[PDB]
Symmetry: D5
Subunit: 195 residues, 10 copies
Amino acid sequence: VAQVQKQAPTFKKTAVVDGVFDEVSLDKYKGKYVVLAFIPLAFTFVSPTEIIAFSEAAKKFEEQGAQVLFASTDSEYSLLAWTNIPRKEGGLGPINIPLLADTNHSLSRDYGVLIEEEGVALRGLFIIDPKGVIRHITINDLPVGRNVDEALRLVEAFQWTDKNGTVLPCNWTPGAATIKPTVEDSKEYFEAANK
Amino acid sequence: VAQVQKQAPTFKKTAVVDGVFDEVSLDKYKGKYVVLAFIPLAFTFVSPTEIIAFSEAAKKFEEQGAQVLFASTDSEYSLLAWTNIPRKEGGLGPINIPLLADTNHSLSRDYGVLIEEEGVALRGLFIIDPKGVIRHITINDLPVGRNVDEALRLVEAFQWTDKNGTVLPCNWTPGAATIKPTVEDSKEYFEAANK
Amino acid sequence: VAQVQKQAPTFKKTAVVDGVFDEVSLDKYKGKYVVLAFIPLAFTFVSPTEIIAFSEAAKKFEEQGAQVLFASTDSEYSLLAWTNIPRKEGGLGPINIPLLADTNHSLSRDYGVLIEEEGVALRGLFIIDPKGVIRHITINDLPVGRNVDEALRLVEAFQWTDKNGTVLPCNWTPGAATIKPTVEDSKEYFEAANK
Amino acid sequence: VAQVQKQAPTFKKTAVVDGVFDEVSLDKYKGKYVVLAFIPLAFTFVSPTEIIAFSEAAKKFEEQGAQVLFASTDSEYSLLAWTNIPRKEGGLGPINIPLLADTNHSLSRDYGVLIEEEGVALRGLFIIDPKGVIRHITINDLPVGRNVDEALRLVEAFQWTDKNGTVLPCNWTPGAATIKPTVEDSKEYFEAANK
Amino acid sequence: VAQVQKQAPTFKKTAVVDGVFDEVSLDKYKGKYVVLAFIPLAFTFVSPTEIIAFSEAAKKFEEQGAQVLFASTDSEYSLLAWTNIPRKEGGLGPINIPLLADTNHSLSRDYGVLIEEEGVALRGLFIIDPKGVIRHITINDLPVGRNVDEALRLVEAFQWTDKNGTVLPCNWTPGAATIKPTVEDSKEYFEAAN
Amino acid sequence: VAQVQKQAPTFKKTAVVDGVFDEVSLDKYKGKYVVLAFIPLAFTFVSPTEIIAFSEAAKKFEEQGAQVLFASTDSEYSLLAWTNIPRKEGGLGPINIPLLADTNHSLSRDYGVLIEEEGVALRGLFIIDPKGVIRHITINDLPVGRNVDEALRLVEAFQWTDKNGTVLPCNWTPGAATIKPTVEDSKEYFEAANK
Amino acid sequence: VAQVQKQAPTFKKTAVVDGVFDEVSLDKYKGKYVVLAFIPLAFTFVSPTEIIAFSEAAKKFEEQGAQVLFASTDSEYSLLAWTNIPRKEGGLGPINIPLLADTNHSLSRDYGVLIEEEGVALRGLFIIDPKGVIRHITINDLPVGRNVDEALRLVEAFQWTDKNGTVLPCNWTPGAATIKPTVEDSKEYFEAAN
Amino acid sequence: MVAQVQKQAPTFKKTAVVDGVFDEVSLDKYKGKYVVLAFIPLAFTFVSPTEIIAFSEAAKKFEEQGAQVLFASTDSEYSLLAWTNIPRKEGGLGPINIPLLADTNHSLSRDYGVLIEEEGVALRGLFIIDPKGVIRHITINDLPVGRNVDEALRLVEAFQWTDKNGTVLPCNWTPGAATIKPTVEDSKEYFEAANK
Amino acid sequence: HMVAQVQKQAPTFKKTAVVDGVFDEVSLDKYKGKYVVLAFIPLAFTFVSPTEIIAFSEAAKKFEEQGAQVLFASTDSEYSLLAWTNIPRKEGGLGPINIPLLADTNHSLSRDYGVLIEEEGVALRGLFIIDPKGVIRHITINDLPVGRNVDEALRLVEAFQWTDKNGTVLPCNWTPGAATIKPTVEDSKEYFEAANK
Amino acid sequence: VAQVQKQAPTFKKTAVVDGVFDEVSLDKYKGKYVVLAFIPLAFTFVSPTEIIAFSEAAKKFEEQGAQVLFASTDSEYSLLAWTNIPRKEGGLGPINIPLLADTNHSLSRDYGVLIEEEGVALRGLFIIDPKGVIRHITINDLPVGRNVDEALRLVEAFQWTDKNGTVLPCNWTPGAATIKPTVEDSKEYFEAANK
C-alpha cells in the first residue's frame, strides 16, 4: 500500500484536465508537491464540495509548489460529464484540478483507500513530495469532507521542513515558531514558547 | 491494519494518567469518540507541542464527546518523567490526556504507524467512534505537527453525521451548511451553496 | 465464471430503475428470462445506443417472458446521471430497463466480462433462463454494438425450446421450421428441408 | 481460456477441406477474419443446419474477408463421412467450409466451449481478426442454432471498425449510422439519431 | 487405470444396441464374462474388420457366457451412423454387439487405452470376469487388428479355470491338457506332455 | 509404466543364455523385434509351458525377425537351475530363449506386470519393434497361458505394417487380405471383402 | 527398519516347512527365541552351507528354546526345488528349518538386509525375544557365511540374561562367569577375573 | 542415514585414548588395515570392560590379520582415559592395547546406527570395515550380552581371504577350512567334497 | 526446540544422578518449595569442573540455609560421575560430594537449557537459578575456561528469595542488608535520596 | 540469538556518549573486551543502580581492557534525559559509559534478552572478546541487579585465559591459583589444592 515515509505508489491514469482527456502521473508534476485526493463517487454529495473547494483553491496550491489531483473510481467519461453539470445542480462545473479516472481500481488499491465491497475510494488524501515520498495521509470515512486549508497547511509545512531542516510544532501555520530538532537548539523554541 | 471503517485495533496499555500509572483502552471511554494520536518519541520537539496543544484543548474535545489518548513507543516511565519536566524545557509538565506506553509496539504496529526500523510511530492520529470503528486517519511524517482544531473539527463532524445522518462538505465546521445525501434532497444544499 | 449450461452468477446489485435506485437480482424476475447485458462505460458511444435500443424493445422482451438488464461498472449515480441527459446529447432518456451499478466489479468479474486492466465490462450479453441457467452468451469487443433482435430471437428460441423440446435450426425465428431432436424424428424435418 | 480481446488460441487440426483431409490453422487464413464455429456432434440435428447455413454463406463471408471454420470433437473421418451423406437424410452433402476434427478436445477445451462431461463442444462461435484477436464470442446452448447473418453482420462490423475507426451502434449493418468515438465528435451521431 | 487382477473400471455409456441408443454398463451383463474392445475410430480401416469379425462371432462368445462390447471415442450418432453404411463400403451393416460411445473419453482413459493427444483409443481388448476383475488385457497398436479366436480362447480359458480351478498351458484350447497347479499334481501334466 | 507406442523401458538384466549367465539388454538385438514375456514364477506350472512353447518356436521368431525373451523376478540361479531340470519334471530342460532374472523387480515394475503385494510378474508380453517402441501388450492373469502363434502373428503382423505401411485386419495372417489406410484405397479392400 | 531393543518387524510369509508349504510367522513360535536368518540366494554357494549347518543344528537351538527361520527373496517354489537337490550338488536336501519365501521383498526390506539393487537379502540374522524384541543382529556381506555356534551362544546368552538378569561378559558361554550389574556386586566378578 | 554392509563406513575424526594419551583417530589412520569398530554403552560398567579387555588381549592377533581394533563409546576422552587408569581388579581397563574413541557428541554412534537416543549410549555394535572403507560385517548385541572376540577375528580373517582369494567362506569357516569357488561349475567341487 | 529463558518455566527433567554415592532419580519436583541452582559443567575428569562442584559442595549448607538445592549436571553418564566421585580431590577427583550430580547422557538437559555445545556434546558452564514456582530467575553461562562463583550464585539466590518475599527490588551489587528499593516512582526516591548523600 | 562462544550479534546503535549522541558498535572498541549490559527501562529503580555502578567502575574496566556498554529499549532522548536528572532524584547524572538506545529492539531481540510482551530487555549482560565471541552471559530477571565486581571478575578471567591458555577455577580472582588444563599438568593444581 501507500505509506507515509515510503515512495508513493506509481500510476498513469486517464484524467480530465481542462475539460479534455489527458494522462496524468506523478512525473507530470516533477518536482512539485502532489496532493492526491480520492473521492468515492461522482454525482454525489460530499465529493463535489471537496473537488470544488480544492479547485477554487487550485492557485493557492500552485503558490505553494503543489499540484492537487483528484482521483475517483469513476471513468473519465463520468468525471467529464460531471464537470458539464454546473455546481448549482451538484455538478462540478469548470474545474482547475485533474479528475483522475481510476476505473481499474489500481490507484485506490495501491493507495489503500479502496473499499473492495463498494468499489470506491475512501476520502483519502495524500501529500507527496518531489522525491515522490508520502509525507502525509488523511483518510476520512465517507460522510465528512476533508479540509482544504489543512491540506494546504500541510503542503506548506512539509515544504518548509524540506527547505529549512527545521521541524514544525502542532498547529504551525507558516510564520509561527519552528523548532531546531537538536536537543540544544530546541531550547530556543520551548524557552520562547512557554511564558 | 488499522483502517478507516474497520474496527480500531483493540488494546489495553499502561498509561500515564493525571500523573500516575493506569491501564487505558478503548472501552475505558465507553460511549465516547477517541482520538488516538501516536507521536514518535518523548523528549523530542514536535511531540511536546502536539501533546500540549491537545492537552490544552482536552476540555474542548471532552465537550464534543471525545477522549484523547496520546501514544508512544516509550515506557510509561519515560512518559511519566516527561510529565515531570516543565514545558519551558521541552517537558510536558502537567497534562490532561493519557499517555499510553506502547513499549512493546503492538499499538503502533496494529495502527500501521510503527516505523519498524526506527521503532517509533509516525504522527498517526485516529478518530475512533463509540461503536469502535475508525472514522478518520491522519498520518503526518515525523517533522510536521498535526493540528488540534482539525482533530476537533473532524470529531464534531463525525459526531454530527453519526447523529443527524446528514453529510458534511469540505471545510465544514459547526453551523456550516450540511447535505442530505440523496439525489433529490441534496439539491437543497447545491442550489443554496451555488457550488 | 459465467458459463453456458451452468447457473448464472447470482448478484444483488443496485440499479437505476425508473429514475430511482433499487436493488435488482436474478430472483426479482422469478419465472422470467433475464437477458443481462454488460456495457463498457456510461457516457460513451455505442453503449447508449445499445441501452436505448434494448430499452425501446423492452415490451418485445416482456411479451417473450424476458426481462432485460443492463449493467456496467459505473456507479448507480453515474448511470442515474446518464439517464438525466437527453439522448440528443448522448444520454439515455427515460429508459424502460434497469441499469445495474457493478461499481465493485463483482458482476463483470463473475460474468467473465470484466476487463481487468480497464475496469469495464466487454459487451457481454447473457440470456439466463427462469431456472437460473445461462442458455446463451454473446460477447462483443468494445467498438461493436450488439443486436436487439437477435437477443430477442435467442430468448424466443429458448422459450420455444424449453416449452417444446424441439431443437432450433440455424436461423430459426418464430414460425420457422423445427426439428424433433431424435434420429427417427428429425428425418421429418430433413426431408421437408431438402430436395 | 479464449476471451474477447485476446489471442484466439492457436491450433493445428486435421479437417475436411473440399472432400479431403488437410491441416488447418488460424495461420492458413492469414489476413482473413476467421469465424470459428464449433458444433456439438456430427450426425445430429441443428448442427447440420448451422454448417449447411454457413456453407451457403461462405461466398458472402469470403467476400468480407472471412474464412468460416467449423469444428467438433468428431474424428476427421466421422466429419468426412457426414459430408458423404445427402442432406435429404441428415447429411451435409458437399460443403464449402472446412470441418475441423477436434478428436482430442484441445480446440474445444482451449475455446471454453467443451462440456468436459460430454466430450462435445457447445455452439461457440469466435470471430478472430487478422491479428488473431478474438472479437466476438457467441455461445449457444445445444438446442438452439446460431444466426449466419449475425456472424456476417459482426464480421462486417469488426472489419469496418478496423478500417475506419468509427464505433458501431446496436443493430448496425453496413450503411447504418456509425459513431466517431470521441466526446466532441459523437455528438454528430447523437443529434442525428434522436430527431 | 485398468490392471489385470484388479476391478474393471465401471461405466455407464450411451451405446448403439440393436441399432438404437441404449445405456450400457458392466452391470448390464451380470454373470457374463465381458470382452471390452476399444477401437481407434468409426469410419476407418482395421476397426470395422474387428467389430465385424466380433459381430460375426457374437454367438460363439454368447455360448461361452461372454458379452462382446465395443467402444470408441466416436459419438453414438457417429457410431450409429457407421452401422448404417454397408460393409462393402467400409460400414458395419447390422452388428450383433453394442458400440460404446466414449465421447468424453472417460472409458478410454479409465482403461489405459486413450492416446491423450489423438483423442482416440489404442486397440485395447479386455476380458473381465463376472466378479468384475480384468483377467486378460490385449493392447494392439493401431496398424494391426486383434484376433477374435484368441479372445474366444481366453474367455474360454478363464471361463474354465474359474470353474475347474486348474490351470491353462500355453496355447491351450478347449480339450487340450490342463495343469493341476500344485507341486504334486502338476507332475501328471509335465510327464504326459514330454 | 510401459505402454504401446511409448518407448520400451530399457534394461540390462542378467539372464540364462545357453547355460551361462549373460547380460541381456534391448539393444542386444538392434534391428530385431523383441518379444519380452513375463512369467510369474520359476518351478511353477503354466510358466514353463510358455517358455517351452516359445523355445521350440524361437526358430520361427528368428525368421520373422524376432528375439523372444522371457523374464521373471527369479534369480539367474533359479532360472539356470530350472533349466537343469528335465521337462518331464516341471523343468525347462535346454532352451533357446534367454531367461531374464529380474531379481530387483525393476523389469516387472517398469513393465506394469509386477504384482507388488506378491513380488511376481503377471503374464505380460510386449512386442517391441526395432525402434524401441512397444507395439503390443498382452497381459494374462496367472491361471491361463498365452499363445505362441498369436505372439508370432503379431510379430509378422507388425513387421508387415512397418515395411508396407498398410494396416492389418482383424485375424490377419500372412497372405490374408491386407488394407490401404486411406479413405479412397481402403475401398478396394472393403469391396473384395464383402458379397 | 529392524533395530536391537525394538520389536521385530512382524510378518506372514509362505514357507517350505518339512518339504510342504506352510505360512510362517514370528508368533507361530510364541515363547521361543527366533533366530531369523537371511540368505541372498537359493542355488548359490554360501547360503546352502548356512542353511545345512543350521538345519543340522536345529535340534541344538530347539533345546535352548530357539526356533530358527531362514528367508530369501526366492519364491517358495525356488526354495522347494533347492530342497529337492542332494547336498552333494547342493544343497539343501532335507532340512529341519523353515525356508521363508520373501518373494515380495517385505521381510528383507523391513529387516534392512535387502540389497535394493539386487534385490536379495544380505546375510542378516536376527535373534528375537519371546517378547518380539530384536536382541541381536549380525549382518554379513554376501561372501561370508555366519557362525551357527555364535548364533547358539547368543541365543543362550540372552536366554540367560532374560532368566537371571545378570549380564554376560565377552565370550561368555553357558557355565562361564557372569556379571551382577551394579557398581558394588560386579566387584566380586572383576576381582575374580582380574 | 546409517551404516550398512556393502556401503562405505561413515568417516569420523574422533579424539581417543591411544596408549593412555589423547590422539585423533580416523578410519584412514589405519589406511590399508581392516578396522573392527566396536561401540560400548558406558565407561565404568560391567560387560564393556570385559569386551575391551578381551579385544585388547587379542589386539596383536588382530594386528596379525591386517586389522586395527577400535572401541568407541559416547563417554568423553577423560572418562575413557580415567577408565584406563583404574586397575581391572576394580572394574577398570587399562593399560590397554587398543584405542578408545570418545564419542562425546554422539555423531559416531548415530552414524553407525547404534545410539539408543533416549539413553545417549551406544549398543554393543561392532563393525568390520575393509581397506576400501566398506562395512563388511555388522554385529549389534543388546546391552546385556558381550560379543565374541574369536568371532570378530574369524570374520576379519574371512574377509581378508575373499578380498584376496576371490573364493567365498561357508558357515563356520575358520582359516584352513574349505572355501567355495563362487561359480555354479567350480562350486560343485566344494559341495561334493563336503558331503556323504 | 525453545530453550530455558529467564522468566519462563525451567524445562523439567528427571535424570539419573549420583546422590550420596548412589544412583538416584532427580527432578525439580524432588525439590518442591526450594530454589534450585541448576549448574552444568562440560566434563567429569577435567580442570575447572571439579573446582566448581567442590566449591558448590562445600557451600551446599549455605545454599540449603537460603532454601536452595544445588544440582550439577554434565553430559557424562552416572557411571563416570560416580566414578569421578570415587577419586580423591588430591588427584582431580571430586571426592565425596554434597550436591547431586545429574547425568545428562542423552543430552536433553543440556539441550533444553540451551547450554549444550552440539559439536562437542558437552554442556557450557550454565548455571540456572529456578524459583519454587519453577521460574528461571537467572542464567549464568560461562565459556569453558573460566569457572563461576559460589558466592554470586548464593547472593542471587538470596536476592531472589528477598525479592519474592519482600516485593522490594535489589540494587546492583546488593547483598542481604544492603539498601533495597521499593519499586514505585514515589517510593524509589526514598532509596535514591539516601544512596546519594 | 547470542550464545556463549559464538560471535556477538553486531550492531550500530545510537548511544548517549558524554552528553551527545554517537553511533556505537562493537568495532568501535577494536581490541577491547566489551561488557554489553542491557537494562529494561530508563527512569526506574534497579536499572540506574547498575549503570551508576558500572559507570563508577568504568576505569577499572578499562584497566582490564574492557569497554562497558549499557543498552535499553528506550530512545537516545530518554536515555539522555535520564542523564539530565540528578542521581538523588532517580536519575543518572553525568556518566562514563555509553547508553545504547535499542528503540527498534533489534539489539535486545538479537541478544535474546528482549521480553517481547513488554518491549524491554532482561538484565542480560554479555562479555564479548576482541574476537567478537560471547564468553559470558549473565541474565537476571528484572527485580534483581547484577554484580559489578563480578562483571570485572570475568573480564579479567578471560582476559587471563586468553593470554595464558591456563584455565580458571571456581571463584578465581586475579592472583588466585590457575589450572593448567591438561591431564598431566593439572596435577600440580590438584596436588597443591588438597591435603
